Design a protein around this ligand. Sequence first.
Ligand SMILES: CC1(C)[C@H](Nc2c(C(N)=O)cnn3cc(-c4ccccc4)cc23)CC[C@]1(C)N
Length: 271
Amino acid sequence: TIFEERHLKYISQLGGSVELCRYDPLGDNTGALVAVKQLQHSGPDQQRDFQREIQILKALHSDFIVKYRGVSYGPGRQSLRLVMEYLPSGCLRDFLQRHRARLDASRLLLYSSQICKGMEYLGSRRCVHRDLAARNILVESEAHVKIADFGLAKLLPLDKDYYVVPIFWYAPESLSDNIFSRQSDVWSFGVVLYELFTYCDKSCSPSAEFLRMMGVPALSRLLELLEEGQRLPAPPACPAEVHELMKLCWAPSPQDRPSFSALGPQLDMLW
Ligand SMILES: CC1(C)[C@H](Nc2c(C(N)=O)cnn3cc(-c4ccccc4)cc23)CC[C@]1(C)N
């Protein structure tokens, strides 16, 4: 929960910057691999942004949320970094593309259900994620996924249900009025269901398809297209039941969107 900087051996970059270090106190190259995050931008707003990320992760205890391992300790105030666990399989985006052939619909549904239970837990703690996408979900093992990237995550105050702060994961209210809530996370979840059932194929990615349907500023056009009720199409060979759930996640009004708690049993019955 307090890692010495001198023992954090740099290996490569993954992602503020997210690095792959080995926590090697012995200095022998046998220590555990860790995911270490730090901001390149110095400042009082940046320090607050990164302090907020740490406090959020430190109090999150789900099997479906990337494990916080601790904070760094080195020479100077500038040396402090966030230490999380490393998942060798990497992001679900790459994993889906590398292993298509062995990932069937029940498997995609098992991941969908786990992401959901994880999103359900985040709402429980009053946490809006703001960056829910396959690129931000990590593979723990064959039948296990975790939610990561808490850099844009905001905690909702006790007396409010929303927060005022790629465009293809944003809800219509986020696009027009920069309103973020658990209801906007659900919209992003529908795009995640879509990404999963497309195996994160680049040629039918939310971007490639929405831009195709699009053709004034690009954001306004997308928002016009969404206002009209146009949506991403059902992924090639997507079970119809799965596509209906995405269309509920994509309800124009936030009150109409199902809750994560409500979506959970639906994805479980589907397997
Ligand atoms: C927030 C992430 C999901 C990444 N962070 C990662 C974390 C973490 N704690 O945030 C943990 N394990 N991990 C493994 C990979 C990885 C990818 C490909 C290949 C191998 C390994 C990337 C990450 C950095 C940037 C990201 C992708 N948006």
